Amino acid sequence: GELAAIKQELAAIKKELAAIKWELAAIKQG
Amino acid sequence: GELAAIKQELAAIKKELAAIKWELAAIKQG
Amino acid sequence: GELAAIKQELAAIKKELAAIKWELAAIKQ
Amino acid sequence: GELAAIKQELAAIKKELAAIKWELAAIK
Numbered sequence A, B: 001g002e003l004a005a006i007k008q009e010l011a012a013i014k015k016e017l018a019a020i021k022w023e024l025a026a027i028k029q030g
Numbered sequence C: 001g002e003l004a005a006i007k008q009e010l011a012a013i014k015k016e017l018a019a020i021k022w023e024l025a026a027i028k029q
Numbered sequence D: 001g002e003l004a005a006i007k008q009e010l011a012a013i014k015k016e017l018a019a020i021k022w023e024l025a026a027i028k
Helices: A002-029 B003-028 C003-028 D002-025
Strands: none
Touching: A002 B003, A002 D002, B003 C003, C003 D002
16 A cells, blocks of 8 residues: 555666666766 | 655655756766 | 664665765766 | 565665765766
8 A cells, every 4th residue: 555655666766776877877988 | 653754755765866867867968 | 673764764865865966066066 | 574674675775875976976
């Protein structure tokens, strides 16, 4: 319920973190 | 105490991250 | 558990976000 | 054991943020 929504936010946070890592890798590269 | 509070905190953290991500994408373009 | 422990992690996360905010301002600076 | 699991997920997110913060500071 609320627990399932928490898991959805946790997963969405991980997606943003990965996005950030990929932006940083591009920045370092160029 | 409540799972809804944690959920809300996580949603706010996810938005923060999204903003960081966008800011970094902008840096990547310079 | 626990609730108290979850609160501390959240607080720690928020502070790292603030440090990141700091670094981003400096890069723009 | 959901609370403990959430706590652990948060700790890992915390550590990733610190690593991102260190990388950021290294930019240029």
